[PDB]
Amino acid sequence: AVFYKEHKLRNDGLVITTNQGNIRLQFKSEAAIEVLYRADSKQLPSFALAQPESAIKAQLTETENHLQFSGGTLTARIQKRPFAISYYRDSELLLAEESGFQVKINFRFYLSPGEKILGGGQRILGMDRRGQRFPLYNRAHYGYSDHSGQMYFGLPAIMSSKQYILVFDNSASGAMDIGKTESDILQLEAKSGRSAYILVAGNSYPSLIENFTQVTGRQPLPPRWALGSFASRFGYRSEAETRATVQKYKTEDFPLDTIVLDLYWFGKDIKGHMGNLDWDKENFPTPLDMMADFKQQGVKTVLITEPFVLTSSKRWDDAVKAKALAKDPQGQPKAFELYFGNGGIIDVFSKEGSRWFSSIYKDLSKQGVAGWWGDLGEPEMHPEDTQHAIGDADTVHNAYGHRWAEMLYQQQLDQFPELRPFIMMRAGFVGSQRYGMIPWTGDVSRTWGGLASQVELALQMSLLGFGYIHSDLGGFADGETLDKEMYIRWLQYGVFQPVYRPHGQDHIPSEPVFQDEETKAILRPLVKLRYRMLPYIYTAAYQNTLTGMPLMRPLFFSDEKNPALIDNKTSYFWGDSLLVTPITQAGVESVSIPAPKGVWFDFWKDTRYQTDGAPLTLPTDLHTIPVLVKAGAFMPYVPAVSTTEDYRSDSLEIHYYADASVPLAQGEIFEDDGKDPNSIKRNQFDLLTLQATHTDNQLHFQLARTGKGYRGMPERRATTLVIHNASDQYQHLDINGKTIAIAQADCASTPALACYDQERRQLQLVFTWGREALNLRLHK
Amino acid sequence: AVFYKEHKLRNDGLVITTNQGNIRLQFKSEAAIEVLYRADSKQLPSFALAQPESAIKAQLTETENHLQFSGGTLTARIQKRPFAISYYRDSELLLAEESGFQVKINFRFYLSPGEKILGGGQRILGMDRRGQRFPLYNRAHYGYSDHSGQMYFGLPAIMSSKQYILVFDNSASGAMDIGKTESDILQLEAKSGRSAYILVAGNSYPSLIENFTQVTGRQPLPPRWALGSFASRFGYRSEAETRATVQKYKTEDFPLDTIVLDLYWFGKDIKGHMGNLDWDKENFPTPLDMMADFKQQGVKTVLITEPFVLTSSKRWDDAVKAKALAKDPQGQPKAFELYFGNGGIIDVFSKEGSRWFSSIYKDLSKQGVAGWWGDLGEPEMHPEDTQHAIGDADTVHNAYGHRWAEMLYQQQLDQFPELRPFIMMRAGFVGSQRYGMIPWTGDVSRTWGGLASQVELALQMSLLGFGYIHSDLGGFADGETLDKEMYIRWLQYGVFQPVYRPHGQDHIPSEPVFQDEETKAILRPLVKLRYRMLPYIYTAAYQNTLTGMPLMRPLFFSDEKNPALIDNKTSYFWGDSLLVTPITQAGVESVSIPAPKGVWFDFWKDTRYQTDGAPLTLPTDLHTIPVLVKAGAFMPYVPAVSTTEDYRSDSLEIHYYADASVPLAQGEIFEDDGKDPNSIKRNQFDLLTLQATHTDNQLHFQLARTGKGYRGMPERRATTLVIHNASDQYQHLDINGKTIAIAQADCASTPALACYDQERRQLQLVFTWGREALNLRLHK
Numbered sequence A, B: 001a002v003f004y005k006e007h008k009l010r011n012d013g014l015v016i017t018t019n020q021g022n023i024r025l026q027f028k029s030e031a032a033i034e035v036l037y038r039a040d041s042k043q044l045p046s047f048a049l050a051q052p053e054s055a056i057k058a059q060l061t062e063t064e065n066h067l068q069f070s071g072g073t074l075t076a077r078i079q080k081r082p083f084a085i086s087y088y089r090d091s092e093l094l095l096a097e098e099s100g101f102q103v104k105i106n107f108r109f110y111l112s113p114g115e116k117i118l119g120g121g122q123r124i125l126g127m128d129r130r131g132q133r134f135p136l137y138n139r140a141h142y143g144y145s146d147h148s149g150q151m152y153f154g155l156p157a158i159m160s161s162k163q164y165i166l167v168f169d170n171s172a173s174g175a176m177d178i179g180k181t182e183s184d185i186l187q188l189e190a191k192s193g194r195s196a197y198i199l200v201a202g203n204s205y206p207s208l209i210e211n212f213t214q215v216t217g218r219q220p221l222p223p224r225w226a227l228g229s230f231a232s233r234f235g236y237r238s239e240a241e242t243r244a245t246v247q248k249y250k251t252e253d254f255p256l257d258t259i260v261l262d263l264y265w266f267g268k269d270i271k272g273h274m275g276n277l278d279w280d281k282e283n284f285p286t287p288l289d290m291m292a293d294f295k296q297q298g299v300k301t302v303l304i305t306e307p308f309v310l311t312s313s314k315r316w317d318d319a320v321k322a323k324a325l326a327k328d329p330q331g332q333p334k335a336f337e338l339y340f341g342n343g344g345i346i347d348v349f350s351k352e353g354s355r356w357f358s359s360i361y362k363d364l365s366k367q368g369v370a371g372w373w374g375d376l377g378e379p380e381m382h383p384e385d386t387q388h389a390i391g392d393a394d395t396v397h398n399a400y401g402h403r404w405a406e407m408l409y410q411q412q413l414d415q416f417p418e419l420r421p422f423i424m425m426r427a428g429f430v431g432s433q434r435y436g437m438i439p440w441t442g443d444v445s446r447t448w449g450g451l452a453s454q455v456e457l458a459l460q461m462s463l464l465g466f467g468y469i470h471s472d473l474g475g476f477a478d479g480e481t482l483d484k485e486m487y488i489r490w491l492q493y494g495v496f497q498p499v500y501r502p503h504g505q506d507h508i509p510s511e512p513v514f515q516d517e518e519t520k521a522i523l524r525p526l527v528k529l530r531y532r533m534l535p536y537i538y539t540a541a542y543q544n545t546l547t548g549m550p551l552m553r554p555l556f557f558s559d560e561k562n563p564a565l566i567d568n569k570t571s572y573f574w575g576d577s578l579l580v581t582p583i584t585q586a587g588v589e590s591v592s593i594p595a596p597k598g599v600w601f602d603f604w605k606d607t608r609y610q611t612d613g614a615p616l617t618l619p620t621d622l623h624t625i626p627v628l629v630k631a632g633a634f635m636p637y638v639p640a641v642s643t644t645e646d647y648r649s650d651s652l653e654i655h656y657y658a659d660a661s662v663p664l665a666q667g668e669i670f671e672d673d674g675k676d677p678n679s680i681k682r683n684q685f686d687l688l689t690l691q692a693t694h695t696d697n698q699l700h701f702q703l704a705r706t707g708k709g710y711r712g713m714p715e716r717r718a719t720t721l722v723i724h725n726a727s728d729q730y731q732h733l734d735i736n737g738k739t740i741a742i743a744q745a746d747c748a749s750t751p752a753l754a755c756y757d758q759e760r761r762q763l764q765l766v767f768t769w770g771r772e773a774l775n776l777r778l779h780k
């Protein structure tokens, strides 16, 4: 039995006293509220909040049986007897406590009939997780395929079809029961840790996500090289092998930005060396030269690191001396049996551990390391009696990787304030994106099932803050011989998901350059396409930094009033304009694409489709996967380069997909130096905008640029605008009022300013796009 | 009747007095003698000699009936009565005067029975010109195909199967009669000008050419961009069209280094504007921006210029005021009716004309022009009564273009001492290569016959000093629709001849980017190959600067004791290692290749051929032309780039064609900054050497580098050495004494240091080639 006794509004937080203790309510924004139970006691701080101490001005109103604590859009309705809080956006009930807070810690909420619930982070259970129960305990799931209730990167958070996000702001071993045990009850449980939750509301899914990232953190724009081709395997055994792989990309003519070194860089065996955190000079004899030589070819070097320091490693004595490792209750360094050997864990929650670990990253970065890979951050093994500075293993578990990213992010920004950190990790917490965390979906099997699960995983993570979630392309775990068709499909999908990083255990090659001729003939133009598409992808990344909008969006964004779409885990949007349907089984001869109502074009073949709702059936081929372009799309391209270090936009090629059904369309292209972490905040960019206005007798484009520009920005770009499905009735073109004839033949064989290709229904305009506004008007 | 009267030896020249006048003999080297008749009178100076005032120490000996004037290798034997000079190398008679000098000026020599005679410069008559008579008067031959006795660039010089070169060092309207009128008489004639000839000897064809260029001039190494892809037509009509063409290369993914602007850059019509020598702002409104924008994309701009200033042009009044034009006997500017209109000719032989013309080049170069095209330098029209500073038109005619190149070369070196001039001209004289002249074979027809004549022309010019002779690829003149198969064959041949410059009248596209899909699919990888092969071509260019060795060599170099080979005009060597046989007729299904005795490989298919003399029959296909690689060849490649401005050799791929028949082989790769005119003289280069030693049980490679290097030179190059026709019996590899196992599987699918591919008979070695010597030893 719990009931209201009294409250105090100051400041600007509401502090309620019940017969069972204090509860603190604070708005972190007009759309998000933090609710802290046991507010009177010492607890771990928030991890989910970017500004935990925030509390914006809200209004409090009182009635006989209720209190109301209201922000701009979100309202908390506090029922006095019995005590229960419920949350409203406008006058719409979003979520209501049932028993609310109990005591172990326990939160119980009602679920509404028909309410669909995404969330929990990485699970393979179906997009709607209602009817499921699972632990909140980051844990490896080696070789997973088509099912998992628990893997590397869980999130103690859900997104509802009612368009709210609920966060359990607790870092401890726990569980989530989404109407499994009791049909109408959502239950959150933890063995210890912070007793708080955060509710965020929105009026649309994009707004919800914008509001969520506003209070949990926005991802800083990654370096542009993060969008390029990575060479990776587990693992290059030597400097010679590493150099030979960089060379193979050059001689096979595949783009390459970054080569990634797994654990052999610090030891010749898988076991026994972890913690050395320094070069194995027997096998990597001249690493500074190696990294400098790669830099000369525009190629970055990334090294793997782990939380564990083995007692057999060269740094054990020093880590103990430094007090860098987590301790046992007795006060000794805690050592335990990992796969790799007996060892301890670096206490990133401590001053000593952070300083010690950070110094090592600084040293290696100074030697030439450009980016960082942190593996096993669950932590993969984490005995319950391990003691960190701020609590035992079970209490801090799901925040270890989160703090590790914060430590590394701060370290990198301190060392290189003019560069954007690259931090790729396996496990984090709500908000880890604010430290630039780029997660991957762990040690996936080399099976079709492993591939078929990746869209579900990516969308689940993307919706709750992680735009750069991706997979080991081609599959990672076990296998005895390459499944060629699977590999090809995986690397094709790879082009249209956030990070292009094929990676697998090295008894089977993961890099595309080591594949057979047919495989390379298929993949080479696609890896090149990835680079040609950089303006499209980098612009989506820019939007992700601005608003949290994920690069991969679920089908359900297309119709927010159709909750059934939430179940779709087979087609997704890559940016605004491409509907992608990966092939995830062998021998598939055709696909049924649930394209939203409207006009769509085959990305590969230019075929125009129109639909009022019924799905579209497309045949498959081995060299592509099915991708449809939304009518009204501006698809921007630059010439392929081998490395983003050579990126130039002096030449732009833009394809506009015209249809009268889209009378107004807009496109944008974000350009900056690809590297300045402050480019957005300081307006050091060149933002290109395109607007199409399509009427019965005219099609006109308005082109403009804003921003203060940047060093090396082109003043004038040669631009080729290719209008697909263009009318054969346009007689003339005006550019800023100057009338120009449209040629009707030989468009590919003359340097024509404007030409219509009747066989392709494409109208091509070639012009100079300078700093002043440009208007191009086509008229019948 | 002519007889000896007396002589005087000083100094170090021999001055002979006959009853008819004085004759001066001077050795310009140990292998070359200048013979000047009428030595007592004022004459035009030598044009052919790089150091006209040279006279090395020779020995004079006298007998009753003879004088002997001898240098290191060449001896002049002077018979006293009747007077006649003959020339000997060792004790071998090379050439004997018949009547020798007469008076118009006339030289008569005996030809030996069976002696074959190349020479005369551009003619289409057969490689051996003996039995032919033709004028020495540079003259246009618009639309030539398969025959010409007189075209743009004649040379008053011959090369004999006796291995001497004879130069008629005379610039005037003349003629050459090579045993036509009289079977055993070579006759040289001129209406006026210098009465001198130069004989150069050698002990082999390469030595002869080395000796010839020693005294006539060596070509300075061109900028590396001269070896790249040129966009050209007659002609881009506007800045917009020019920019659109640069853009088309970018969007079609063809390499492009340079775009070339024909006469529309200075006027909207073909007639009436020549002499404006300034931008037509109506059609090229922002040329400084245009050139700067191209430079940002690594693309150079070259402009056409001509000798003629029309009375209708904007510069007529000023040229007259400056006294820049040739005059009539009366002293007025000489005006005459050219195709383009009434106009005069710039007197490049005068101080005033040179200063005036040079100032105009300086101005345009300062604006951003990177290289220069001088058309119509025959001069195309040149009335006999035109007076230049040093003589009338007929007297100086064949040296006009020569002096024009000298003027421009000096101008460019004065303006940009740290760059190599690019000067492309149609007409010159013996020695013009010393001013960097890059000639092309004029306005060739768009016919198979026009293509079929190009090897003959190129070889004739190459042998007598012009390594960069090339053709308007695809054909230039007339035509009404593209002959697609002809065009393709011409641009394929283009890859294996000195300058890659498709160019034609613009009613049919000359650029490969404006061709149909099939044409582009065929040509794109070949234009890319041109760039991948830059280390091979640029190294041949280096050798040409060093020794005069032409880039294209005739088949007859392969066996100097087989004079019948001299007739071959259908196969030639591109550098040392490639025997190329262009396809020069439609529908050819196979070719008979007269490969020299030895082992040869199909460049495209790796097929091994062996022959003891009989020709090799190869089938043709549309995507290649037949090219054989000589066993022992080291073929070096770098990754394709879009422009030589981006050239890097951090990654090398070298293919060695092994065969036991070649127990010793050598290769070299010349690397410098691609631009420094002084790189060779100052040793600012990186010269890579490879030596193969192939015995019954071992194959070993010795790799080394010399030179002082240059700014940006890579210290360490990732190198992939691919050994073709490698034994399947090599068990191990030592690199500098460190033994390494050779893998026997999965060579394309692993980062192996050494791997043998049994199906391809290729052994691949991947390693780091640093500054120290490297020895790689394979042993059975």
Ligand SMILES: O=C([O-])C(=O)[O-]
Residues within 6 Å of the ligand: A660, A696, A725, A726, A727, A728, A729
């Ligand atoms: O858009 C149009 O009107 C057309 O396609 O003709």
Ligand SMILES: O=C([O-])C(=O)[O-]
Residues within 6 Å of the ligand: B660, B696, B725, B726, B727, B728, B729
């Ligand atoms: O060269 C060899 O000896 C061979 O091919 O086995």
